[PDB]
Amino acid sequence: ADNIREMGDERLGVMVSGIEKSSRRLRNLINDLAEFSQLGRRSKPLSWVSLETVLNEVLADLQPRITEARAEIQADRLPFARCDHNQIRQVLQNLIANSLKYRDPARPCRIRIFAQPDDNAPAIRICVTDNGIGFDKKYIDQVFEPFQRLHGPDDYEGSGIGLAICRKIVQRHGGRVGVDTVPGQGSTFWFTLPVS
Amino acid sequence: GLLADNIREMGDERLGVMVSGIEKSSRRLRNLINDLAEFSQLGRRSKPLSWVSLETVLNEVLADLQPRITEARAEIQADRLPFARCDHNQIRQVLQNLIANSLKYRDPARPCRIRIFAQPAIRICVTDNGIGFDKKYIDQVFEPFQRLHGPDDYEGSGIGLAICRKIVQRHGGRVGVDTVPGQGSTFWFTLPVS
Ligand SMILES: Nc1ncnc2c1ncn2[C@@H]1O[C@H](COP(=O)(O)OP(=O)(O)OP(=O)(O)O)[C@@H](O)[C@H]1O
Ligand SMILES: Nc1ncnc2c1ncn2[C@@H]1O[C@H](COP(=O)(O)OP(=O)(O)OP(=O)(O)O)[C@@H](O)[C@H]1O
Ligand SMILES: [Mg+2]
Ligand SMILES: [Mg+2]
Question: Can you tell me which residues bind Mg(2+) (chain A) (predicted)?
């Protein structure tokens, strides 16, 4: 006679739900891989487009997610740049979304999209700083690698491809990507765009 | 009190079914993912065309599948395949998909008898004493992810012949078939000489 079966039902519930969450993450990856890979197929040769209109697009899509976070986005005027507008909005997309996703629940999170002539063909470097949780400054090189997550899927579910994608789009443009982080303080990612 | 377990009896059968159904879906989905990635690596592995023995390719493809061939109690007439200027890996891939498809779609009433010949552009053929298909569906036959069969009685991924066509077309060839439902079908592909 089984007291055991009653315990099996507890364990079954765990596993069936494990397959269900483990299979949902697999669906997310399949989608993120299909959206981002089709961008390369739709690639157009670069022309000069206003980066401010592109940014205003990204603030349109995120208009639900921004209010959800009661976050304030201070948007400076972004110049023209010679780039692929569809692909560069995704770079703004993924970056503003990460600054929203990793908002810290104790302070109203504020995001800023700056523009400044960098130095390292003069390239304008666009930067997005946010007051978020940040990550450990040991991870600056690792962060841009795919599927290289810093924490388990318990606290944040993601695919690990978002920001590694940004790097390769910015690299098709002959730019670089980089980040400064202050754990607990906030993190700022930036990417450069070449001129000519 | 028995009603505690009178309940268990009726459900445990279903659970075994359902979980086993989910198990097949996980095999099928993994097969598809793998076959697509093998395909993406084949495009990467493209090497410029050279002269390869087409009979060597046949014997390799006949090597991997000889486990599946003994399973099938089928007879292979392995004719002499000449040289042709092509990619060895990709043409090995094309022989597999056709010979494997010709093994998979065999008739359970007849020992399927298979013929791999070549007849002059050089055209290579695989004739099979297997199932036929109906000429109303030839567009489906070559369409990717459109199989003519449900997954229960015949397993597969649906990309096999769409794969072959991109290979044979990268070689400047054709894909084509004559079919006789119930008797058998013979698929063929051509290669340029120059
Ligand atoms: N603003 C940020 N603050 C803190 N960590 C960040 C920030 N942006 C990115 N990260 C780190 O980047 C790691 C992976 O980034 P990435 O954006 O590529 O993936 P993701 O957010 O998990 O998922 P997805 O691909 O769906 O966007 C995250 O685990 C997080 O640690
Ligand atoms: N020798 C054959 N005899 C009859 N029908 C065939 C034969 N070879 C292929 N077909 C038909 O072609 C359809 C698609 O063939 P194809 O080989 O491309 O895919 P598949 O065998 O279903 O999958 P995969 O090769 O990805 O495992 C098959 O469903 C089958 O109906
Ligand atoms: Mg992201
Ligand atoms: Mg096949």
Answer: 98
